[PDB]
C-alpha cells in the first residue's frame, strides 16, 4: 500500500473547494459533519436529497456533501481530489476530529482509491459506509465503451480498465478503514455482485461485506439505487455510523428490517424522489461527455497498471 507524502491537486485549491458544501454550515466550523459523495451522473443533492441528507441529520450529523464536475462524469482521480480536499477542510473545521464518510455508486472507488494513493486522510477518516461500490468496476459498460457513448469515468468503472487494474495492484482491495459495503446481487448496473464473495465488486478484504440476499434471501430484490434508499440499507447504515468499531453490526439487524421500499423515516415526498433517484443520473449520462479512450493514468497511479491502454498509449512508470 502506497505511504509517505500525497501526490500533488492537479486543480487549484480554489476550484476544490467550489465543490464542497455542508447544510447549514461553513466547512470551516462544523459540528459533527459527514461526507457524502455522490454516485455517477449525479450532483451531490441530487443523489441524497431524498434520502441520506435527511436520515444523517435525523442521526445528529451535519451533512456535507461534494458535486465534483460535470455530474460526477469526467476522470475519477481529479474527483478524488476533490474528496481528498473536503476530507481535509472538514477534519480542520470540526476541531481536528475524524469523521465519516458515505458513498454510493462511484463515490464508493473513489473513496477507496483517495485512501490508497493520499495517505494523509488515513487518519482523518473515521469510518467508511459505501452502499453498491464497484471496486472493481462494472462488465455491463463494456459494450458502451466500444461505441463511444461512456464519459471518462465510465470508462474507467469498466472491469479491466487501467484504473481498477491500478487499484488493485497498489492493495487497493483491502479495507484501509474500518469499511462496511452495501450491496445486491440483483443490481443492473454493477456485475458480478452474485457469488457473495471476494469475486463481486463490492467486496474488500477483512471489510464488513453486507449481500442484502445473503441477510434477507434469494426472494429480496432490490437495485442500484435501492442499495443506497431501501429501508434494509437504512438499518445497516445507522448500525454502521453507530458501531463501536467502525463497521455494521450484525446482532442490529434481521429478517424484519428486509424492507426493499425507500428508508420509513423520509417524508412521501422523499419517498417517491428517491424512488426514482436514476432517472437525473441516466439523463446526465445521454447528455453528457462521450469519448472513445479510458483517461491517463496520473503519474502517481502508472506504476500500478504497467501494460494497459491508455488515451495516449500504453502505461509506463
Ligand atoms: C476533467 O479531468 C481532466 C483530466 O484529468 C482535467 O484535465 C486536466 O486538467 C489539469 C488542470 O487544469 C491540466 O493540467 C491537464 O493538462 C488536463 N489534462 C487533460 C487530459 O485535459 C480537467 O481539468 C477536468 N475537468 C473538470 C471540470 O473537472
Ligand atoms: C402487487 C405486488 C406488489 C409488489 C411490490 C414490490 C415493491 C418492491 O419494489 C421496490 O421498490 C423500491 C423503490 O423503487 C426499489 O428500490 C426496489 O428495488 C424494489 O424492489
Given at each position: 500500500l502506497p505511504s509517505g507524502s500525497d501526490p500533488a491537486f492537479s486543480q487549484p485549491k480554489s476550484v476544490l473547494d467550489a465543490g464542497l458544501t455542508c447544510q447549514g454550515a461553513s466547512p470551516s466550523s462544523v459540528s459533527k459533519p459527514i461526507l457524502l459523495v455522490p454516485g455517477t451522473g449525479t450532483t451531490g443533492p441530487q443523489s441524497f436529497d431524498s434520502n441520506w441528507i435527511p436520515l444523517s441529520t435525523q442521526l445528529g450529523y451535519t451533512?456535507?456533501?461534494?458535486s465534483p464536475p460535470p455530474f460526477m462524469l469526467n476522470d475519477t482521480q481529479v474527483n478524488t481530489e476533490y474528496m481528498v480536499n473536503?476530507?481535509?477542510?472538514?477534519?480542520?473545521?470540526?476541531?481536528?476530529?475524524?469523521?465519516?464518510?458515505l458513498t454510493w455508486s462511484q463515490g464508493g472507488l473513489v473513496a477507496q482509491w483517495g485512501l490508497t494513493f493520499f495517505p494523509s486522510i488515513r487518519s482523518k477518516v473515521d469510518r467508511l459506509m459505501a452502499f453498491?461500490?464497484?471496486?472493481?468496476?462494472?462488465?455491463?459498460?463494456?459494450?458502451?465503451?466500444?461505441?463511444?457513448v461512456s464519459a471518462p469515468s465510465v470508462w474507467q468503472?469498466?472491469?479491466?480498465?487501467?484504473?481498477?487494474t491500478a487499484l488493485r495492484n497498489a492493495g487497493?482491495?483491502?479495507?484501509?478503514?474500518?469499511?462496511?459495503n452495501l450491496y445486491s446481487a440483483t443490481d443492473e448496473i454493477v456485475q458480478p455482485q452474485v457469488s457473495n464473495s471476494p469475486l463481486d465488486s463490492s467486496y474488500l478484504f477483512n471489510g464488513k461485506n453486507v449481500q442484502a440476499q445473503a441477510v434477507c434471501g434469494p426472494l429480496f430484490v432490490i437495485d442500484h439505487a435501492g442499495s443506497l434508499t431501501s429501508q434494509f440499507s437504512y438499518?445497516?447504515?445507522?448500525?454502521?455510523?453507530?458501531?463501536?468499531?467502525?463497521?455494521?453490526?450484525?446482532?442490529?439487524?434481521?429478517?424484519?428490517?428486509?424492507?426493499?421500499?425507500?428508508?420509513?423515516?423520509?417524508?412521501?415526498?422523499?419517498?417517491?424522489?428517491?424512488?426514482?433517484?436514476?432517472?437525473?443520473?441516466?439523463?446526465?449520462?445521454?447528455?453528457?461527455?462521450?469519448?472513445?479512450?479510458?483517461?491517463?493514468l496520473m503519474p502517481y497511479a502508472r506504476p500500478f497498471a504497467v501494460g494497459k491502454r491508455t488515451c495516449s498509449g500504453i502505461v509506463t512508470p
Open positions: 451533512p456535507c456533501w461534494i473536503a476530507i481535509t477542510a472538514l477534519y480542520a473545521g470540526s476541531g481536528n476530529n475524524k469523521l465519516p464518510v453498491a461500490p464497484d471496486y472493481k468496476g462494472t462488465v455491463l459498460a463494456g459494450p458502451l465503451d466500444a461505441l463511444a468503472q469498466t472491469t479491466g480498465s487501467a484504473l481498477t487497493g482491495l483491502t479495507q484501509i478503514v474500518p469499511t462496511t438499518v445497516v447504515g445507522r448500525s454502521a455510523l453507530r458501531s463501536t468499531t467502525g463497521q455494521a453490526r450484525s446482532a442490529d439487524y434481521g429478517i424484519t428490517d428486509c424492507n426493499p421500499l425507500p428508508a420509513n423515516d423520509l417524508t412521501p415526498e422523499q419517498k417517491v424522489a428517491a424512488a426514482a433517484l436514476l432517472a437525473p443520473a441516466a439523463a446526465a449520462i445521454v447528455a453528457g461527455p462521450k469519448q472513445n479512450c479510458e483517461p491517463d
